[PDB]
Amino acid sequence: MATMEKVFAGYEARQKVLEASTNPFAKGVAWVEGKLVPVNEARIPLMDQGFLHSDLTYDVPSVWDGRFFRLDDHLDRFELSCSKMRFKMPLPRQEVKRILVDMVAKSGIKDAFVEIIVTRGLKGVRGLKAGESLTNNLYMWIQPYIWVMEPEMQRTGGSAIIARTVKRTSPGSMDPTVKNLQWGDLTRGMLEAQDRGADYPFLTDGDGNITEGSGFNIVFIKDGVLYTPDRGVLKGVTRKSVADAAKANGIEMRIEFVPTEMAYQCDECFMCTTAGGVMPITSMDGQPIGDGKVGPVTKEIWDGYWAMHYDDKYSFKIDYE
Amino acid sequence: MATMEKVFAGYEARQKVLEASTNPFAKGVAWVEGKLVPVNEARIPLMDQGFLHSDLTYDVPSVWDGRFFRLDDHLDRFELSCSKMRFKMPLPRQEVKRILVDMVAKSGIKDAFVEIIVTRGLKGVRGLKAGESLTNNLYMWIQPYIWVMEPEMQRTGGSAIIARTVKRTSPGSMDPTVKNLQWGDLTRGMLEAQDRGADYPFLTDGDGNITEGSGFNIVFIKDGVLYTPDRGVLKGVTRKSVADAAKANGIEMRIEFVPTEMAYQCDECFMCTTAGGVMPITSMDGQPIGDGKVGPVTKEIWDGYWAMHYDDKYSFKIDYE
Ligand SMILES: *Cc1c(COP(=O)(O)O)cnc(C)c1O
Ligand SMILES: *Cc1c(COP(=O)(O)O)cnc(C)c1O
């Protein structure tokens, strides 16, 4: 569309400038043990329990056109995730925010993926002896904005399959509201999608309901109403932003059980996530969804989501000096 | 017992020698990108997908009294795990074996924990573009033998709870026969055990059956017969060695559905794993199991397991030169 072309033209112009930069942080920068290092040189201890037992939680805010998007909502969710895991995040919130902004500013990156991780640290829960306390670790980094669905694919939509060989990890085993890197099911789904000649996997709960996919929530549009699963999934900030844009435009959105049959009967579909935004799906199990083009309500939400990036209710300008 | 005292006296004597060594590898040694580094200096790339999405498998053989125990069974299982994950292990099997043995020899460690990991590498499955191929990474290390249950606790047994707040990750989400580091459920179980004043968590499948715990298989003894769960668990090498020792002594062992009620009706119980061996459990949900002492069949298996460490069918001597 018109607004797709706007957003992407601006991104492509900024990318041209960034690709030409000699700033050693232009390809990204990490914070490790209080030091900034270029991201592709960053290393972590082999003995970190975030590696050894994936005992960590994380969050991913973003920067668009030099504006941090919903950073506070990310930090709020991350505090909740840290508490549910019994971590103590090693630096106060305000210091974390200041460091993230300085990192961005230092790098010159205008459109950024940001990741924050807290891990159990160098000593595990399994080994704990009487009297001992654990010190948790923090890792953060900025890189150029990652696209789960590239811009050119967002214009046409991508393809999906309903995964048949795996189901989403039950909340009784791992709470899917705690953003985590334990992607065993998600990775199985990706491999299935590859095998089946589809771009993206949608996992069910194994009981006839749609959940989420490999790093994204799932939204269906049917008879002018948005539907998205309630249980079994991460409470996305992108999905919240979709609800905000729906409300702003008078579009109903239901957060509820979504049966698998919706994937075959929907009028439109899109995935949503911070790394990419609103990502239309125009094929399902090898068949076009309607006419196979990106639908009107999807584009209305798409435009609304990107407009929020310039609204001071949901974003703030970074001073790059 | 008599054989407990034998094994542990030998270990304590060897540990005294190791604690006195100035070898820079005596605290452990890792192999990273073809170089040996002291384990507590070893680092991995932040961008490794083994960290970023826990997209890895691993295995843990061991060395006892300068003898590698069942190394081939570990390498066989690890090949299977690598294939199920669609990894190509970066070095041939024979080279991996030679490197592991050289590492041990170089370190001087007689009683060792060994870990081998293969990860998806520096590029993820999610990001894959048309035409691209992935190169997987290898990490290996040796350290002094880790005890999931310390020697002194093996003499008395430890305590367990049947976990009520978590269930083992279903094979429909993550195959538990592929040894993995995605411990979300296991870590929840450990925290529950701590909360409940018990040493170890036993997880159910959420359908009335016992599975495994936080890095160990679970064995019950009832009316002179060993019972251990079939589905939902890793096919331990320790559990296989238990079956071997049972057979050698005319003790029946059933690998089958184990209802939760067995935890409350058993005559004896033990956990088993490479990092510790045979680990008696003498309390369950806060109540002693029988007289609360380590039982006779448990000790018969315990002695048998350690005898196997000196049998050339199941072990080989390392030349330390
Ligand atoms: C990150 C993520 C999402 C999206 O959450 P956002 O807050 O919108 O970025 C959805 N599901 C999974 C599994 C994720 O990892
Ligand atoms: C390693 C492990 C076991 C034990 O396997 P062994 O081959 O005997 O060391 C059992 N269950 C889990 C979850 C494990 O990680």
Side-chain angles (χ1 to χ4, degrees), chain A residues 58 60 74 77 168 179 183 186 212-213 215-217 234-239 272-274:
Chain A
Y58 79 112
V60 174
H74 291 276
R77 179 171 74 190
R168 186 79 180 87
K179 214 173 161 52
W183 273 34
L186 300 183
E212 61 186 349
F216 56 82
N217 292 117
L234 189 79
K235 299 185 175 181
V237 176
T238 316
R239 183 180 87 172
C272 60
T273 199
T274 301

Side-chain angles (χ1 to χ4, degrees), chain B residues 243-276:
Chain B
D244 294 331
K247 186 189 288 177
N249 289 288
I251 297 167
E252 187 182 359
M253 175 162 176
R254 302 189 188 156
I255 299 171
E256 67 186 19
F257 279 118
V258 180
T260 306
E261 190 56 31
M262 181 54 89
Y264 307 109
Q265 292 189 248
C266 60
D267 295 327
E268 332 184 15
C269 180
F270 62 90
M271 302 170 298
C272 60
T273 199
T274 301

Side-chain angles (χ1 to χ4, degrees), chain A residues 53, chain B residues 58-61 74 77 168 176 178-181 183 186 211-218 232-241 272-277 305:
Chain A
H53 290 107
Chain B
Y58 79 112
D59 218 301
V60 174
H74 291 276
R77 179 171 74 190
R168 186 79 180 87
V178 172
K179 214 173 161 52
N180 71 81
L181 296 180
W183 273 34
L186 300 183
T211 65
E212 61 186 349
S214 37
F216 56 82
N217 292 117
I218 297 165
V233 305
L234 189 79
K235 299 185 175 181
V237 176
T238 316
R239 183 180 87 172
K240 176 175 279 215
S241 301
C272 60
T273 199
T274 301
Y305 171 75

Side-chain angles (χ1 to χ4, degrees), chain A residues 51-53 126, chain B residues 54-61 74 77-79 81-82 85 87 113-119 138-139 141 177-183 186 214-216 234 273 275:
Chain A
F51 179 63
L52 294 190
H53 290 107
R126 183 220 53 72
Chain B
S54 198
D55 194 353
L56 68 81
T57 184
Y58 79 112
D59 218 301
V60 174
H74 291 276
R77 179 171 74 190
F78 188 57
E79 282 175 21
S81 291
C82 286
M85 303 280 301
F87 299 141
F113 178 92
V114 180
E115 180 154 328
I116 180 163
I117 297 173
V118 166
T119 83
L138 178 62
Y139 298 100
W141 76 97
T177 71
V178 172
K179 214 173 161 52
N180 71 81
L181 296 180
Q182 301 191 14
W183 273 34
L186 300 183
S214 37
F216 56 82
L234 189 79
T273 199

Side-chain angles (χ1 to χ4, degrees), chain A residues 30 32-33 39-40 42-48 50-56 58 84-86 115 117 119-120 125-129 139-141 143 146-150 165-175 180-188 190-192 194-195 214, chain B residues 30 32-33 39-40 42-48 50-56 58 84-86 115 117 119-120 125-129 139-141 143 146-150 165-175 180-188 190-192 194-195 214:
Chain A
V32 178
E33 304 149 11
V39 66
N40 298 121
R43 308 277 174 270
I44 71 162
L46 177 65
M47 297 294 103
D48 197 296
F51 179 63
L52 294 190
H53 290 107
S54 198
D55 194 353
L56 68 81
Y58 79 112
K84 281 172 174 190
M85 303 280 301
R86 304 188 185 177
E115 180 154 328
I117 297 173
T119 83
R120 191 71 64 191
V125 173
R126 183 220 53 72
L128 264 187
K129 295 316 185 271
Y139 298 100
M140 306 176 280
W141 76 97
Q143 64 183 97
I146 297 177
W147 302 94
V148 165
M149 185 183 281
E150 294 294 333
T165 75
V166 60
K167 57 175 177 174
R168 186 79 180 87
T169 302
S170 169
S173 297
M174 182 68 156
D175 182 353
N180 71 81
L181 296 180
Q182 301 191 14
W183 273 34
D185 60 330
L186 300 183
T187 297
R188 280 169 60 172
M190 282 187 297
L191 297 172
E192 183 183 338
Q194 266 178 12
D195 289 346
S214 37
Chain B
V32 178
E33 304 149 11
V39 66
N40 298 121
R43 308 277 174 270
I44 71 162
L46 177 65
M47 297 294 103
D48 197 296
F51 179 63
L52 294 190
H53 290 107
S54 198
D55 194 353
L56 68 81
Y58 79 112
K84 281 172 174 190
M85 303 280 301
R86 304 188 185 177
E115 180 154 328
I117 297 173
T119 83
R120 191 71 64 191
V125 173
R126 183 220 53 72
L128 264 187
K129 295 316 185 271
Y139 298 100
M140 306 176 280
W141 76 97
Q143 64 183 97
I146 297 177
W147 302 94
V148 165
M149 185 183 281
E150 294 294 333
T165 75
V166 60
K167 57 175 177 174
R168 186 79 180 87
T169 302
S170 169
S173 297
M174 182 68 156
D175 182 353
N180 71 81
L181 296 180
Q182 301 191 14
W183 273 34
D185 60 330
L186 300 183
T187 297
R188 280 169 60 172
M190 282 187 297
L191 297 172
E192 183 183 338
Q194 266 178 12
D195 289 346
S214 37

Side-chain angles (χ1 to χ4, degrees), chain B residues 193-221:
Chain B
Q194 266 178 12
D195 289 346
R196 297 177 58 193
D199 300 315
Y200 300 92
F202 292 184
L203 282 74
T204 80
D205 64 356
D207 198 7
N209 305 302
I210 304 287
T211 65
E212 61 186 349
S214 37
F216 56 82
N217 292 117
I218 297 165
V219 186
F220 296 101
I221 309 179

Side-chain angles (χ1 to χ4, degrees), chain B residues 12-149:
Chain B
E12 299 299 341
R14 295 189 296 275
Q15 276 303 96
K16 191 179 180 177
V17 170
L18 186 62
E19 285 157 3
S21 170
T22 63
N23 183 321
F25 295 159
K27 289 178 199 193
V29 55
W31 184 99
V32 178
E33 304 149 11
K35 309 213 162 143
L36 299 189
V37 304
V39 66
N40 298 121
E41 299 174 14
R43 308 277 174 270
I44 71 162
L46 177 65
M47 297 294 103
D48 197 296
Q49 289 282 322
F51 179 63
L52 294 190
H53 290 107
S54 198
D55 194 353
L56 68 81
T57 184
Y58 79 112
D59 218 301
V60 174
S62 66
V63 182
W64 188 257
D65 201 3
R67 301 183 62 81
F68 241 121
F69 186 68
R70 303 190 79 140
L71 177 58
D72 285 333
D73 290 318
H74 291 276
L75 289 175
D76 285 353
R77 179 171 74 190
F78 188 57
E79 282 175 21
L80 180 59
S81 291
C82 286
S83 178
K84 281 172 174 190
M85 303 280 301
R86 304 188 185 177
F87 299 141
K88 204 190 176 288
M89 167 172 72
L91 292 176
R93 178 187 176 119
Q94 286 330 305
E95 179 171 356
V96 170
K97 183 169 167 171
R98 175 193 72 67
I99 287 165
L100 293 174
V101 168
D102 182 54
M103 288 165 76
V104 178
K106 283 176 147 67
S107 72
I109 298 160
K110 303 307 189 176
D111 313 281
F113 178 92
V114 180
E115 180 154 328
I116 180 163
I117 297 173
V118 166
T119 83
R120 191 71 64 191
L122 295 189
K123 302 316 221 99
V125 173
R126 183 220 53 72
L128 264 187
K129 295 316 185 271
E132 293 174 349
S133 300
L134 297 188
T135 299
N136 306 149
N137 286 338
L138 178 62
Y139 298 100
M140 306 176 280
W141 76 97
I142 315 313
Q143 64 183 97
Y145 191 99
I146 297 177
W147 302 94
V148 165
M149 185 183 281

